[PDB]
């Protein structure tokens, strides 16, 4: 009876040296991400809307143009909602579908529903158009390295639909895409043909990005079982800082500080966490001041902060995958 699902417990990163860190810093482009990955998502895109369809097409197209062997899947399903039955579609992009283990990066691509107010429309820039764009920029910036995966471990990206409540958050009105996909993955044998392991056993770590893009974010170290990975993010931020590779950044104002959060923040990681998947929840506390406000827009985003986090996240992923 294989112990492969325990490999994640002993997995260590292959740390990048200074030269490699400089290479990663120079290899990502915040202006290219802004124009090509982010702006097309700064639209109304609540579930079932024309915008949801356009956002999904954009995400798929941006992944499809890459060289790495991404396998795209649209996970479409029905769920009861305050407005009756509706259809939702999660987007899953996977390198090496049959590899037993995957490091998983995720965010939600839907925007919260709000009727138009005084000619303004809610586009959820930090929530979570920026996280979406960061994942797309990561796939682009690391494309050559990821192409080499074509340690039975690879990478998967999940863009959840329906993270937001249609009304105000409640247990049955929220997390539509993640509740559905976690249940589906928990009941799907993995690798193909397995007798007693599921796709969830194959999820090494779920790194969920949410509410990123405002100035001065502070991310708490939420869970003991992923604390060592939170410490790696701290170390990466520190070294990139010391090498002069971050912009408008100080250690006093670092993003990954030494502090935990004992409370529970409901988000897409919940259905996975309650089924035993280790989670690194990259959501800041406190939330952006513009949270769930029409001001959660492009003008209020902090460019250098997002650029800095792109560098940190890309190093984290390469070190995790030994690339
Ligand atoms: C309360 C309840 C649930 C959440 C989750 N959340 C995250 C992004 N938009 C909403 C936040 C506050
Ligand atoms: Zn939200």
Swiss-Prot record:
Entry's Gene Ontology BP terms: peptidyl-pyroglutamic acid biosynthetic process, using glutaminyl-peptide cyclotransferase; protein modification process
Question: Effect of altering residue 112 to A?
Answer: Lowers activity by approximately 40%
Which Gene Ontology cellular-component terms appear in the entry?
extracellular exosome; extracellular region; ficolin-1-rich granule lumen; specific granule lumen; tertiary granule lumen
Q: What are the glycosylated positions?
A: 17, 258
Q: Is Electron transport set as a keyword in this record? A: no
Q: Which residues form the active site?
A: 163, 210
**Outcome of swapping residue 267 to A/E/L:** Abolishes activity
Explain the purpose of this protein: Responsible for the biosynthesis of pyroglutamyl peptides. Has a bias against acidic and tryptophan residues adjacent to the N-terminal glutaminyl residue and a lack of importance of chain length after the second residue. Also catalyzes N-terminal pyroglutamate formation. May be involved in the N-terminal pyroglutamate formation of several amyloid-related plaque-forming peptides.
| Gene Ontology MF terms in the entry | glutaminyl-peptide cyclotransferase activity; zinc ion binding
Q: Which gene encodes it?
A: QPCT
| Domain of life where this protein originates | Eukaryota
Q: Cite the EC number.
A: 2.3.2.5
Q: What is this protein called?
A: Glutaminyl-peptide cyclotransferase
| Consequence recorded when altering residue 169 to L | Greatly lowers activity
SUPFAM superfamilies with a match to the protein in the record: Zn-dependent exopeptidases
User: What family does the Swiss-Prot or TrEMBL record give for this protein?
Assistant: Belongs to the glutaminyl-peptide cyclotransferase family.
Mutating residue 128 to A leads to what result? Reduces activity by about 50%
Binding, Zn(2+): 127, 164, 292
Q: What disulfide bonds does the UniProt entry report for this chain? A: 107-132
Q: What is the catalytic activity of this protein?
A: N-terminal L-glutaminyl-[peptide] = N-terminal 5-oxo-L-prolyl-[peptide] + NH4(+)
| Main location as per UniProt | secreted
């Amino acid at each position: 009876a294989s112990a492969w699902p325990e490999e994640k417990n002993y997995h260590q990163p292959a740390i990048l040296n200074s030269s490699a860190l400089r290479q990663i810093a120079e290899g990502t482009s915040i202006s290219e991400m802004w124009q090509n990955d982010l702006q097309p998502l700064l639209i109304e895109r609540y579930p079932g809307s024309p915008g949801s369809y356009a956002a999904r097409q954009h995400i798929m197209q941006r992944i499809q143009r890459l060289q790495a062997d991404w396998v795209l899947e649209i996970d479409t399903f029905l769920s009861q909602t305050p407005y009756g039955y509706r259809s939702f579609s999660n987007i899953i992009s996977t390198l090496n579908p049959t590899a037993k283990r995957h490091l998983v990066l995720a965010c939600h691509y839907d925007s919260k529903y709000f009727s138009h107010w005084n000619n303004r429309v809610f586009v959820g820039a930090t929530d979570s158009a920026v996280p979406c764009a960061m994942m797309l920029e990561l796939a682009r910036a690391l494309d050559k390295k990821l192409l080499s995966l074509k340690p039975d471990l690879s990478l998967q990206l999940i863009f959840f639909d329906g993270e937001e409540a249609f009304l105000h958050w409640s247990p049955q009105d929220s997390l539509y895409g993640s509740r559905h996909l976690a249940a589906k993955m928990a009941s799907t044998p993995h690798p193909p043909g397995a007798r007693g392991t599921s796709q969830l056993h194959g999820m090494d770590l779920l790194v969920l990005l949410d509410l990123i893009g405002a100035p001065n974010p502070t991310f708490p170290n939420f869970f003991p079982n992923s604390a060592r990975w939170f410490e790696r993010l701290q170390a990466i931020e520190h070294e990139l800082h010391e090498l002069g590779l971050l912009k408008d950044h100080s250690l006093e104002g670092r993003y990954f500080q030494n502090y935990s959060y004992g409370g529970v923040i409901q988000d897409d990681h919940i259905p996975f966490l309650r089924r035993g998947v280790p989670v690194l929840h990259l959501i800041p506390s406190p939330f952006p001041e513009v949270w769930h406000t029409m001001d959660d827009n492009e003008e209020n985003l902090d460019e250098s902060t997002i650029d800095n986090l792109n560098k940190i996240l890309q190093v984290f992923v390469l070190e995790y995958l030994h690339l």
